[model samples]
Target: MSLEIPEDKIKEASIIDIQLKDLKGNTRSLTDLKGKVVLIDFTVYNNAMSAAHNLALRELYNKYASQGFEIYQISLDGDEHFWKTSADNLPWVCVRDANGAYSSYISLYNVTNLPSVFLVNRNNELSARGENIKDLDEAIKKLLEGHHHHHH
Candidate 1:
């Protein structure tokens, strides 16, 4: 039997605010990141490709972070300690979903594949996701440039 997700939580042009605790146990939400380019990533910490993915992501984070790019990574690993250990050195927001594979957030964003990713533009709109994002680097650059007028 399939579970029904709330209509409001469904993925739309606008992102659904994610309110969850980070590795440090501080509650973080997507709403707080308004006006910045945000990457909402759903991942499993123990997956075989997890380290490679994160390493690549770290490079992106380092390159664009000063330009208001942020990564809000959600770990679907059931072991809290393991997730925490894996995320300890990560600079971005690393949060865990207690529900693991059954997490409502996964269904809310229609993420079927593990290590799925969604991008939020500076205006807090869902700019792209999954296979639609042809080039992650280019996407972030465009979003950052699109909102550059605000700083000047």
Candidate 2:
């Protein structure tokens, strides 16, 4: 089978402007998420690591949603129905990869592990990757501090 790895790239650089649709069929582009501290979570549903990370992510989301934090999680679950059901309660953008490991996003990110996270700064540049949920929180906090708090 032939696979197409995006030439635009999404590793060690500004993430590619990859577009995916949410469960509600809304087109979400990475470019649209700029100017906020974004967590690009790659994982499959029904995985322990993903479950743990999702819990932590919910905390972060609740704490920082008003402060301009967001998560765009991609589930590599081949079963779209199951994935949707599992993610029904997730407040953030949840979508399926369908391509699993063969997807360009996975290959570009070199995600050999079950759950991996990439933290993108407000400038839309790939900042750091979190080894664990705690580390992910730290990266998020650091980026949040760097982002200017504007007063309306």
Candidate 3:
């Protein structure tokens, strides 16, 4: 079924299907998170903002993991050591392009800005978008409700 992504979200922007390796050397995909409130963030490990933003994202991931929420971290950072040493035991799905700035997947999302977060619903539609992360709870709650909330 074709999902109904919110109109204002990343114009034709979808989830990151990162077949890339995780911090633990395991591979993951967006499909595995079906029926979940997916929180996908694109970041570069070399960026100083990586640590802080990820920490917050991880915190939210922990809080809502049991509530059918999932967090996917996409690292476009070129340094493997930074990806490894920097992210050891983060309890979330992390993928790296390893190609850094040249990754088509990374560029396709128009992630010219650092730490861009896209909120896709269970059906894999663009339910919401949090640019620069000025807010989280409200946007996430909206995504959790999906299109069903309007009926009430």
For residues 1-152, write the lDDT of model 3, one tens digit per residue.
22233445556435445566778777666666666877877788778888788878877776767767888777877787887777676676777876766777557666666557777667665554576446566556666655576611
Q: Clashes per prediction?
A: 0, 0, 0
Report how far off residue 79 is in candidate 1 (Å). 1.4
Give the runs in model 3 whose Cα sits over 4 Å from its true position: 1-16, 132-134, 146-152
Best TM-score among the predictions, by candidate number: 1
What is the lDDT ranking, best to worst? Answer: 1, 2, 3
Per-residue lDDT of candidate 1, residues 79-144 (tens digit): 777788878988888988878778887787677776688888776667778579978888888888
lDDT of each: 0.78, 0.70, 0.68
RMSD in angstroms, all models? 5.2, 5.4, 4.5
Error of 3 at 34 (Å): 2.1
Q: What residue pairs are clashing in model 3?
A: none
Q: Per-residue lDDT tens digits of candidate 2, residues 19-108? A: 777777776666767757777877777666777778888998987767888898877767776677877877888866658656777776
Would you estimate the TM-scores of all the predictions? 0.83, 0.78, 0.74
Worst 10 residues of 3 by lDDT: 1-10
Residue 135 accuracy (lDDT) in model 2: 65
